[model samples]
Target: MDLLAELQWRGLVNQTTDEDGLRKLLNEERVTLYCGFDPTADSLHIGHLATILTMRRFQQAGHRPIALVGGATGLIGDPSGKKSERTLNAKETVEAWSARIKEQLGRFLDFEADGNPAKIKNNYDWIGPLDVITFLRDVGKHFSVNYMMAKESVQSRIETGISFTEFSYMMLQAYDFLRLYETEGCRLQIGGSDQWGNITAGLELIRKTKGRAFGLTIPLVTKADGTKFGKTESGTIWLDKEKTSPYEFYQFWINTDDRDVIRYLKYFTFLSKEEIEALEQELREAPEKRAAQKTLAEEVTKLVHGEEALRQAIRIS
Candidate 1:
């Protein structure tokens, strides 16, 4: 299947700065693209599953992928999807957590592949050393308060209120995109749907500062019952084994809604179109057997955890 068609069929594409242009770019050359993750916690939760898996798909398709850890942006916190101001993390705390999170991210993508190797970077390396004066004069001057206020990240919080610190996070992320474009020749950025505002803000910065760029966001993972994707009885499922045992994590996927299972097989697994279609038929005919959900759990668990962890999960289950 064509790359764009596959993404669309799997419900991966939500919004993009330019669709026709990206399709052309993909067909012409091995494009460099990226996705950013914030170390708001020491471990990545199940919430990051779709976004990271999307990055993996691009790499498998022969595109160079950059996994960016937002050390600087996490300090202030993102305002998207939040109802109120965030409690800022201490500099020392964020820096410590950032290091561990960077390590965890490395587990998902290959860094030493023959071609199109995945690269990991911390925004703090650049943003941490930035001077306030230079930030205001250079990056800050390009954006206006009114322009910032109109963004959904800020607009959604008008009733309660948003702080200047959180408001400025939009620019910090934009700067990260610009820096990647310049340093790595990265032409595209991807994230969850909640990040559309920030992703486009990055594109706006690139266009204003240098030239055109692109942004693509994936749909937020959801449940058939209209609940959020990452929740479990104990709370949020995490990537780290200590936080969410591999058994518990496996159960999360194994118990997927019958309606949502086949969709996830396409969204989260590296299974081919034919394989998923076969699973879909099984889902329709033998819903009680749950063959689709088992494959979904096994494939996803193997990727996020590992073969050994997957074995343990199967044993526990």
Candidate 2:
């Protein structure tokens, strides 16, 4: 199967700018793709796993993946899912968080792959040195106030009030796409569902300035009971074990609802289609045994926390 088909099978794709075009490109070439993670916190929570792991899937299929740390945009704060204004973080704080985020991102990707090594990038390297005059004349000229105001991210925040800083976030992200396209020969950008507007904005910028590029986004994880996916009674599931203990992390998956277990196995683990189907069959036959839940717990725990920690978690439980 092709890479896009594999992603589709896992239920990972939400939307693509041009699905047919992207599929053809992936089939023919060793594409370079990226997904940006803003350093909003020192550690990434479980909510971030979908995109991070999707990038890994692309890498395993023989394409280069660039994990871009948003040093510049984190300071500005994206307005995609926010209902109200965000209090800006201090530069020193953002700088510290960016370093920690880069390290955490490093853990998930193979930096030493023979033909398709993963690369880490910070947008600040270019956005930091850019001058105001050049920004307005070069990048800013391409977008209009009318076009920008119509985006879902901006429309959602209109009544509540949005600042110029947040309004211009699309441009900064757009510039990141253009920069990656130019310098790295990157052909695609992927993100969460909420990022649809920003991802399309980047595509529009690329179409205007460069020739062509693509955008893709993954669906937000949801629980079958209609509650949130990542939170427990305690708090958000942090990837850092110090914040969320390995034992607790293992338990989270172990307790997966029968309604959501098979889907999660597809999303979070590298288990093969045959293996997952067998588990699905077992689920239909013996719900009491919870074989699927145990496998999901084991695979994801080992993926995130390592083999020894998984053993310790099982032992402790």
Candidate 3:
């Protein structure tokens, strides 16, 4: 199957740069790709959990995946999807959060196997020591203020007054790609739809710096009822079982709305197209049975928790 086509079918890929070229690259070699996670929280919420699982899909497809925790960028919060400026956290606080996030990222990806092992990298190792004047002269010079301001992330925040620190976030993120290309030979960067502007900035930097690069963004999963996904009335659902119990995690999927469950099964599970279609039929014929929802919950619980934990979740459910 065409991997990109499969991603499109799964409703995962939102946008991509040079689709034909990237497809050729994927077809030819084990292209190294990365997705960045800003350590905004100590525990990854369900939304973040789904995003990281995309890396696992790529790894299973025989490509190398690099999960980058934004130890540096997290210091300057991303303005995307935020109506108000973020409250800056202390450096030590962010560092602690970064470590927690990296560990969670490692749990989802294979980092030790011989074939196309996954890697976890922290931008802090490179971005932390950047000198202001040097950053301006080198990376900052490449991105114009007007060009930066036009981004949806920036444009939406301009009326609310974005700080210079947050305004320069795109540059910081772009430099991560440049450094990764130089050191890790990374060719692609992936993220949620809100990150398209930042991901493209990285692609532009790679091309200007004499290399080919690709950017792909995942469509932000939303519900058919016009509400966001991954949040319950109580609070955000977290991947860390401590924050959200394994039983709660299992119930989150099993409780999926009839309108959203089938799409979610496509988005989150490794089930084949035929398998999903069969589930869709089951939904049509016997919505009361909830076979699709059970499978969705089980597959995702098994992936996040071990089979033993999934069994425990099932028993509890």
Candidate 4:
């Protein structure tokens, strides 16, 4: 199946450009694609799942993916969907986190000489030495303060005191799009809906600096019971099993809300449309079996960890 249709049928197209045109673009040729992973923490949490899985799915369909580690931007801190100010991580600490994240991300992608293998880049390479004056005049000058203030991140943090560094992060992310466009010729970027502000900024920057880039955002995963998507009484599920015992992670999916399991199976798992539909039918007939959630967790856990981890995550219940 074509990559775009697969995502479309699976409900992964939370947002995108002209549907027909974008489909053609993806199918015309598998262009290099990218998604950035910030090293604000020691390891990536389950919230990062949507973007990472999208990139991995693209690669599965024969496109090269670039997993960008945000070495430069993590220092400024992001204000998205938060009610408090982010205490900035020290440069040395963020630097270390960047290395660990890069290594972990390598596991999800093919990095060697394999066809359509992935590439990793650090934004610090371009953004680190760039002088503030040059940035303000050239890139920053283009995005007006009014527009910056209107961003969800900035607006959400206004009462809590949004810092200049975080407020200006949109421009920095824009510069990344410009750089990636020039250096790698990548066309499309995928992220969760919260990144809409940053994604649009980068697309606009590309328009000003060079050309237009495309954006696709998937819906943020939400649990049926209205609790956190990845957290439980224990803690958040980790891509690394050490943070979450394998048995715990398996139960994470087995307990999916009946309301959300169908959407999640499509959005997170690569289950074909027909198979997912059949599962949904079975779920209606036998809710006690939890047919939908069982598959949803298994596929996603396997994708992130591997077959062994996937097996361990199975229902001990």
Candidate 5:
């Protein structure tokens, strides 16, 4: 199957700007795509795995992937998934968080692949130097109040209130898309389901300025039981081992609800369709044995933590 088909099969695709065109482009050429993570926290949690692994999938398919750290936008705060305005972090705190986030992002992608080495970019390099007049006249001109207000990110906050800083975030992201397109030949941007508004805004900016680009969003990971995906009684399942021990991480997946296990195997692991189907059969034949859940735990733990850590985690259990 093609890359898009593979993603669709894994249930990674929430929406795409132009599916047919993107498929053709993926098949025809080595596409450069990017996904951005704001430094809202010092470490990325398990919630971020879906998008990060999807970037790895694109790289494995021989396309270049750029993992962008939102050094500039972190201070501005993204209002996408929030019901309330975020308190702004200090520039120093944001810079520190960006550095740590960038390091964590590096572990998941190939930096020295033969044809397509993954690249890490901090948006501060470009957005930091721009003058106010140039920003308003150039990047800000394409978006109007009506257009900005119409976005789901902004619209949702209208009844309460959204600060001008958060309100203008889409334009900053839109500018990132334009800058990446012009400089890095990036033709696509991918993000979480909540980022659909911001991603489309980027495409809109690219269309108004250059010509074309694509955007894709991954669905929010959900559980069969209507609770959150990454949070446990302790707190968020951080990717950082210091925050969430490898044993704890392994237990998290091992404890997956039977109804949610099969879907998670497809979304989070690199196991083939046939292999997963076999596991599904195992699940049906002997639910008590829990072969599927065990495999899912081992595979995901080994992927996130290393073999050594995984061995230790299993030994502890």
Candidate 6:
């Protein structure tokens, strides 16, 4: 079966220009793909949960997946899907967080025992030592300020404010994709729908400078109550139980809108079509029971942080 078609049926396909073309590319052969995580904090928030599962789905299906640690770009945060600009993590602090993220992410990807060993890459390897003029002449020259400003990441930050660092983020991201393509033959990039601008930036940069590359992004997580997805005020329902308690994390998923159940299943689970249908039917059978939410949370929690965390989540909730 065509992988892109599968992704579509799963409702993982959000907004892309050439869905047919992407499907064709994915169906042809093994494609190397990537998702980057910024070290904006000591640990990744639930904001990353969707993409994390997205990568896992692709990998388990026989594709080579690479997880890029954004040691460089984390310093130049992506402003899409956010109300305000990110106060750039200090270099020293980001470096520290960068190391921690590597450790955290290393848990998710099967780098050793696998059909295709998933890789973990640090952007600082190439982006860190780049010279200013070289950056301007090599990559910066390929991108125009006008083109950069056109991205939602920039426009969204304009009303309140955006730093030059945030403004220059796409360049750093463009470089990450370019680096992956050059080193690993990685052809696709995935992330939150907010990353459309950055993903496009990378694809366009690759097309202009290299050749063609693909991009996909899932929708931003929002809940039925008009609140953000995966938050309980204590903080993000993190995968690391140490950072955020297991019970706290489980409590986050136990509450899902019936309307959003199927959508959540598509985004949050790797369940079989038949199984997903069963889950849908389960929801219909017992909307009051929330069987789907409990199952979804347990499956995702185990895959995400770990089983112990899932247990704690259920216990606390």
RMSD of each: 1.2, 1.0, 1.2, 2.1, 0.9, 2.0
- TM-scores for all candidates? 0.97, 0.98, 0.97, 0.92, 0.98, 0.92
lDDT minimum window of 10 residues, candidate 6: 231-240
> After superposition, which runs of candidate 1 have C-alpha atoms over 4 Å from their true positions?
none
- The sequence of per-residue lDDT tens digits that candidate 3 reaches over residues 253-275 is 99999999988998999999999
* Model 2 segments more than 4 A misplaced: none
Better of 1 and 6 by TM-score: 1
Native-vs-model 3 lDDT? 0.88
Clashing pairs in 6: 246-313, 247-312, 247-313
Q: What TM-score does model 2 achieve against the real structure?
A: 0.98
lDDT of each: 0.88, 0.92, 0.88, 0.81, 0.93, 0.80
Sort all candidates by lDDT, best to worst: 5, 2, 1, 3, 4, 6
The lDDT of model 2 is 0.92
Residue-level lDDT for 192 in candidate 4: 81
Question: Please, what are the lDDT tens digits per residue for candidate 5 over residues 1-317?
Answer: 38899999989999999999999999988999999999998999988899999999999999999999999999799999899999999999999999889988999999888789999999999999989899999988888899889898989999889989999988899999999999999999999999999989888888888765899999999999888888699898998899999999999999998999999999999999999999999999999998999999999998888889999999999
Candidate 5 regions exceeding 4 Å error are: none
TM-score of model 3 (CA atoms): 0.97
Q: How close is candidate 4 to the true structure, as a TM-score?
A: 0.92
lDDT of 1 at 8: 95
